[PDB]
Amino acid sequence: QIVSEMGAGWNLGNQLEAAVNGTPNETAWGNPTVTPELIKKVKAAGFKSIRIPVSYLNNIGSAPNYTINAAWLNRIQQVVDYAYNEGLYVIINIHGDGYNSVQGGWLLVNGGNQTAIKEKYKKVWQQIATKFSNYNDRLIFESMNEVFDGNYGNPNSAYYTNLNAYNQIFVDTVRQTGGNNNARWLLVPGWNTNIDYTVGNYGFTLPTDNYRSSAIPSSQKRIMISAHYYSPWDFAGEENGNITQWGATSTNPAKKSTWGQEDYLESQFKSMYDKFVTQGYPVVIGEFGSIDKTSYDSSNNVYRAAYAKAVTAKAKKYKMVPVYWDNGHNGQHGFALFNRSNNTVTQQNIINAIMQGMQ
Numbered sequence: 001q002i003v004s005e006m007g008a009g010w011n012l013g014n015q016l017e018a019a020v021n022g023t024p025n026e027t028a029w030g031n032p033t034v035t036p037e038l039i040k041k042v043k044a045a046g047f048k049s050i051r052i053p054v055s056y057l058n059n060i061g062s063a064p065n066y067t068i069n070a071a072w073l074n075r076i077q078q079v080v081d082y083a084y085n086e087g088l089y090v091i092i093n094i095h096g097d098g099y100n101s102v103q104g105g106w107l108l109v110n111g112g113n114q115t116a117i118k119e120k121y122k123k124v125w126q127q128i129a130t131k132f133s134n135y136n137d138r139l140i141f142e143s144m145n146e147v148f149d150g151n152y153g154n155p156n157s158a159y160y161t162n163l164n165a166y167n168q169i170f171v172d173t174v175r176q177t178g179g180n181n182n183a184r185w186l187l188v189p190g191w192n193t194n195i196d197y198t199v200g201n202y203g204f205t206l207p208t209d210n211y212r213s214s215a216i217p218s219s220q221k222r223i224m225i226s227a228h229y230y231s232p233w234d235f236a237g238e239e240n241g242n243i244t245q246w247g248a249t250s251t252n253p254a255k256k257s258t259w260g261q262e263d264y265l266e267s268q269f270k271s272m273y274d275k276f277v278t279q280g281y282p283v284v285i286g287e288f289g290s291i292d293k294t295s296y297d298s299s300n301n302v303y304r305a306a307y308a309k310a311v312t313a314k315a316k317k318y319k320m321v322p323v324y325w326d327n328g329h330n331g332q333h334g335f336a337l338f339n340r341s342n343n344t345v346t347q348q349n350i351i352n353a354i355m356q357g358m359q
């Protein structure tokens with residue numbers, strides 16, 4: 001399967017998506033410039049795929065051409081090479097651009113100018129796809145990252161239609177730049193990469209792949225579905241010491257998460273299997289992880305490893321690819337498993353839990 005070959009994934013987080021004042025800058029969010037030795041270390045840890053968040057933002061020139069700074073494409077291509085030349089699977093996306101909350105963000109489903117958004121998106125993907133056209137199947141394009149209106153409840157149907165439109169433009173645009181783009185795996189999310197809003201009857205539609213092999217048609221899918229998983233937020237993302245433990249081995253009610261335990265995890269990943277995996281769409285859990293709370297509770301890393309084990313093992317069970325969110329921050333509320341400055345492992349137990357989960 002594509003899924004077994006991809007094994008477990010690691011995110012090169014807070015690098016090529018990092019941006020200040022709208023301008024992408026891989027050193028702007030506390031990490032050093034990426035070097036090939038980092039990617040060699042991650043591979044050595046057991047990871048077989050790397051996900052590479054990339055932001056474009058002000059590196060995109062004006063209309064009507066929306067030309068991407070040559071030096072930026074050349075940088076992205078160097079970083080992708082670090083992974084690709086190591087025999088890994090590599091995912092590149094459009095990351096910061098899709099966020100209302102990121103300065104310079106423009107790929108907004110709540111935008112009034114959709115015809116303008118879609119034209120910029122098409123032209124941007126055209127250039128990225130042209131740049132990467134000779135790379136093989138180990139290079140995956142991910143259409144966008146977490147795309148929504150900034151609101152956490154029920155998705156607006158008209159807005160979901162916009163998101164669906166971007167997925168479709170992405171697919172057809174990439175296919176039309178031709179081999180190896182005509183054949184390569186393309187990864188697409190639903191609403192806010194949220195499982196419930198992606199599997200439920202909220203508006204998600206699968207993109208057609210009509211421009212692929214148009215003269216010798218179809219019909220085997222070269223599309224994957226994205227979702228991210230950080231539930232329960234109280235344990236995995238809330239930046240305070242209220243909730244520091246998780247799962248069946250925790251027996252401390254004052255500190256244990258109040259939802260999203262093992263039962264919930266099962267039913268969530270079960271729904272992605274039922275809706276997509278069984279239909280021939282691989283599924284990539286493109287981000288998962290829990291923030292460092294050892295500054296509040298000296299037992300927290302036990303539960304960070306337990307959480308990562310459970311998440312990885314459940315994905316393995318349902319034939320989806322688990323990809324760890326590492327933002328390089330070793331510290332309070334950090335996600336890092338490596339020190340990128342000294343190229344050393346900082347969370348061996350969590351890496352161990354991932355590899356155990358992948359068995």
Ligand SMILES: OC[C@H]1O[C@@H](O[C@H]2[C@@H](OC[C@H]3O[C@@H](O[C@H]4[C@H](O)[C@@H](O)[C@H](O)O[C@@H]4CO)[C@H](O)[C@@H](O)[C@@H]3O[C@@H]3O[C@H](CO[C@H]4OC[C@@H](O)[C@H](O)[C@H]4O)[C@@H](O[C@@H]4O[C@H](CO)[C@@H](O)[C@H](O)[C@H]4O)[C@H](O)[C@H]3O)OC[C@@H](O)[C@@H]2O)[C@H](O)[C@@H](O)[C@H]1O
Pocket residue numbers: 013014019020021022028029030099101102103145146228287327329335
């Ligand atoms: O214009 C950018 C804009 O971003 C706004 O927030 C949006 C932005 O969040 C960035 C964060 O992403 C997290 O990963 C997420 C991932 O992208 C998603 O795909 C995933 O699904 O969710 C993930 C989890 O949330 C990532 O983990 C965060 O780390 C990142 O936050 C940024 O962190 C950096 C680095 O800070 C840390 O390391 C260095 C330490 O010094 C620091 O104390 C640590 O916390 C921040 O960079 C720092 O910026 C400060 C102040 O500006 C500078 O002084 C300093 O030089 C620099 O290191 C950065 O500010 C912070 O945002 O994208 C995702 C979207 O959800 C968010 O809404 C912010 O609200 C804006 O202020 C602005 O930064």
